[PDB]
Curated annotation (Swiss-Prot), chain D:
Descriptive protein name: Transient receptor potential cation channel subfamily A member 1
Disease named in the record: Episodic pain syndrome, familial, 1: An autosomal dominant neurologic disorder characterized by onset in infancy of episodic debilitating upper body pain triggered by fasting, cold, and physical stress. The period of intense pain is accompanied by breathing difficulties, tachycardia, sweating, generalized pallor, peribuccal cyanosis, and stiffness of the abdominal wall. Affected individuals do not manifest altered pain sensitivity outside the episodes.
Subunit-structure text: Homotetramer. Interacts with TMEM100. Interacts with EGLN1. Interacts with the scorpion wasabi receptor toxin at the same site that electrophiles but in a non-covalent manner.
Mod. after translation: TRPA1 activation by electrophiles occurs though covalent modification of specific cysteine residues in the N-terminal cytoplasmic domain. Hydroxylation is required for TRPA1 activity inhibition in normoxia. In hypoxia, the decrease in oxygen concentration diminishes the activity of the hydroxylase EGLN1, thus relieving TRPA1 from inhibition and ultimately leading to channel activation.
Function recorded in the entry: Ligand-activated Ca(2+)-permeable, nonselective cation channel involved in pain detection and possibly also in cold perception, oxygen concentration perception, cough, itch, and inner ear function. Has a relatively high Ca(2+) selectivity, with a preference for divalent over monovalent cations (Ca(2+) > Ba(2+) > Mg(2+) > NH4(+) > Li(+) > K(+)), the influx of cation into the cytoplasm leads to membrane depolarization. Has a central role in the pain response to endogenous inflammatory mediators, such as bradykinin and to a diverse array of irritants.
Organism expressing this protein natively: Homo sapiens
Domain notes: C-terminal helices from the four subunits associate to form atypical coiled coil structure; this region is probably involved in binding the inositol polyphosphates that are required for optimal channel activity (in vitro). The ANK repeat domain consists of a convex stem structure formed by five ANK repeats and 11 additional ANK repeats that form a crescent-shaped structure that surrounds the protein core.
Coiled coil: 2-31
Gene: TRPA1
Residues the entry annotates as binding a 1,2-diacyl-sn-glycero-3-phospho-(1D-myo-inositol): K6, Q7, K8, Y9, R10, L11, K12
Compartments reported by the entry: Cell membrane
Domain of life: Eukaryota
Protein family: Belongs to the transient receptor (TC 1.A.4) family.
Full-protein interval shown: 1041 to 1079 of 1119
Length: 544, 80, 79, 39
């Protein structure tokens, strides 16, 4: 393999023999695969050999092997933080590998925490951050790599970016400043709005997402554009939500009205308010239709807009009050139901909407068994209690069974009073069916629903904070993608001053596994050395 | 509660519990706990031809029973 | 098995319900058997739905809750 | 957590002792003399 004895000495980390060779006319050559003595010293992590071999020519520091890797790449990959620091201090040159994997990338992919920390603490951290591949399928930006692989290194880096100054008592002298340089991708494809936040939320970095720097970044983006967009959306919806509420409250239902006033003698007392409210409702509905022109939410909005048009239709063409008020009831009900979904984009009400959605989904899943049970009990009660008004029709019977599911069994009026008056056709059968219904629906079905709901709520609460931050990040990312060029540069800060005074099992197990793997490797090397000792030692006394 | 109360106020305006918007929301709050007066409020007016919108009122009753006393109470019991 | 008893009751009450096809019977017994037959018909359709990927787990949950209730029924009836 | 931390300390001590042992064996190879198998 063309291995020089100097290469062997550097590989096994023998400083004195390396010095003896270099002093007596040694030469720097390259073995097979393009390696050298510095590469072997980097692989073995012998800092003394590096410091002894580096100050003879100052020309082997930046040498490329057959794959293009340098000494820094091997030193960072093998986990030798001190060797990496020694190399970097001695004017090491950063060169991308033929694969386009830098030494920092190799350190991150092998999950070497101390090497990454030493690289960050180095005076050339920004330079090492600058060089990375912008188009390679792998080997992405270093910040994303440390977010994905080593959250603790990124936490330390952010605490370095914390910039906690003026630490002289709590006497309203704090001028703590937040820097946002590392939260923005440093390359400059497409421009992703929040690369760091998306990386954190994708990898479930809840501990990293809860850092004060990230929280303050989200808050600053909020006050920059998120609150403005949120207020705009809520005002656009309220412009039709509110006037409908005034129209409903100030007009007695079932009574016809138009722009002039109440027509069912004419009132002409709230005429201006009524006309303004219907004009606003019509304009908001037309605006919603236009925004639709240019999912459960879509159906909800379509029903809302259609019923809003029909409700305030007497603005131009008169209509019967019956249809008008049916559409008004439908419109107001669905208006507030849709405002419920409009509240989802908040940090205090979103989780409740998520819980409502999951419980509703479970109920819709169980509705088949529900309706089959209701059909059985309703038909039974319809045959058994046919002479009673609630069970006089099959549809009324199923509706009454649905009503009494919640435990409102009218035991006395429906069973006991007819029985004592000799009105039950089948007394024993009716009482047995009553006992069976009470055991089955209000006890068993309701207990099943309450257990399913307690499981759903627990599952949702497992990922509460992560979900909240995920919704906030998604909303801000969509808003950034909406505002193309100018508003971003107008509101981007990269810095903000805040006045506080107002004047863990998987990681530990993986660490243990790495320690055991290192022990195994060192034991193989030790066993090989002892076998060599037995092979090469000489015996002159006990030759048998 | 506002949604269901306004709906019940328009649909059942001819009944004393839902004769006023405030009374309508208070009655909806009361029936959240499962004390829906199904018979007196829905069935008796229906058989006497007193409901203005029978199909709409019954659909709203089913929706209310599914939503508030089942889903909301189950959500509260899970949170607790 | 519970399914066999359910099906036997269903079939017997079905024969009695539509018995006037050949031999007339009093309407009282006919309609008692009709109520029993329809109730148990849909109760057995519940078990027929068990062999599905969307409704089987709900039937399993119903069965386990019913078994627990039958276990506790002794204390229940004493109280 | 206490048991896991104790195991981690035991493994750390094993690692340190293995480094010392490896250094001693390297010294043995460095300083031992060979008079028969000199190739």
């Amino acid at each position: 393999h063309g291995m020089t004895p100097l290469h062997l000495a550097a590989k096994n980390g023998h400083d004195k023999v390396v010095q003896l060779l270099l002093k007596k006319g040694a030469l720097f050559l390259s073995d097979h695969n393009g390696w050298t003595a510095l590469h072997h010293a980097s692989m073995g992590g012998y800092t003394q050999t590096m410091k002894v071999i580096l100050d003879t020519n100052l020309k082997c520091t930046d040498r490329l092997d057959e794959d293009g890797n340098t000494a820094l790449h091997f030193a960072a990959r093998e986990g030798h933080a001190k060797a990496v620091a020694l190399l970097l201090s001695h004017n090491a040159d950063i060169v991308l590998n033929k694969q386009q994997a830098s030494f920092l990338h190799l350190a991150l992919h092998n999950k070497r925490k101390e090497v990454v920390l030493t690289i960050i603490r180095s005076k050339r951290w920004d330079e090492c951050l600058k060089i990375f591949s912008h188009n390679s399928p792998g080997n992405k930006c270093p910040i994303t790599e440390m977010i994905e692989y080593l959250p603790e290194c990124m936490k330390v880096l952010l605490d370095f970016c914390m910039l906690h100054s003026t630490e002289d008592k709590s006497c309203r002298d704090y001028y703590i400043e937040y820097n946002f340089k590392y939260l923005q991708c440093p390359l400059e494809v497409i421009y992703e709005p929040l690369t760091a936040l998306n990386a954190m939320v994708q990898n479930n970095r809840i501990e990293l997402l809860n850092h004060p720097v990230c929280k303050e970044y989200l808050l600053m983006k909020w006050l920059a554009y998120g609150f403005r967009a949120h207020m705009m959306n809520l005002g656009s919806y309220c412009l039709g939500l509110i006037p409908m509420t005034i129209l409903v409250v100030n007009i007695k239902p079932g009574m016809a009205f138009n722009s002039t006033g109440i027509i069912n003698i004419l009132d002409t007392t709230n005429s201006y308010l009524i006309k303004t409210c219907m004009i606003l409702v019509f304009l908001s509905s037309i605006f919603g239709y236009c925004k639709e022109a240019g999912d459960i939410s879509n159906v909800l909005e379509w029903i809302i807009y259609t019923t809003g048009i029909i409700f305030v239709l007497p603005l131009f063409v008169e209509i019967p009050a019956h249809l008008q008020w049916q559409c008004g009831a439908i419109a107001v009900y669905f208006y507030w139901m849709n405002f419920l979904l409009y509240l989802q984009r908040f940090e205090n009400c979103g989780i409740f909407i998520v819980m409502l959605e999951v419980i509703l989904k479970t109920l819709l899943r169980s509705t088949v068994v529900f309706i089959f049970l209701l059909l059985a009990f309703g038909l039974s009660f319809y045959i058994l209690l046919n002479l009673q008004d609630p069970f006089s029709s099959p549809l009324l019977s199923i509706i009454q069974t649905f009503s009494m599911m919640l435990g409102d069994i009218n035991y006395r009026e429906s069973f006991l009073e007819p029985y004592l008056r000799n009105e039950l056709a089948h007394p024993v059968l009716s009482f047995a069916q009553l006992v069976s219904f009470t055991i089955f629906v209000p006890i068993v079905l309701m207990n099943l629903l309450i257990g399913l709901a307690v499981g759903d709520i627990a599952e949702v609460q497992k990922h509460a904070s992560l979900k909240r931050i995920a919704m906030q990040v998604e909303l801000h990312t969509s808003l950034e993608k909406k505002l193309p060029l100018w508003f971003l540069r107008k509101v981007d800060q990269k810095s903000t001053i805040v006045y506080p005074n107002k004047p863990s099992l998987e990681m530990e197990i993986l660490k243990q596994k790495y320690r055991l793997k290192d022990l195994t490797f060192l034991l193989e090397k030790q066993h090989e050395l002892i076998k060599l000792i037995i092979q090469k030692m000489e015996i002159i006394s006990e030759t048998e």
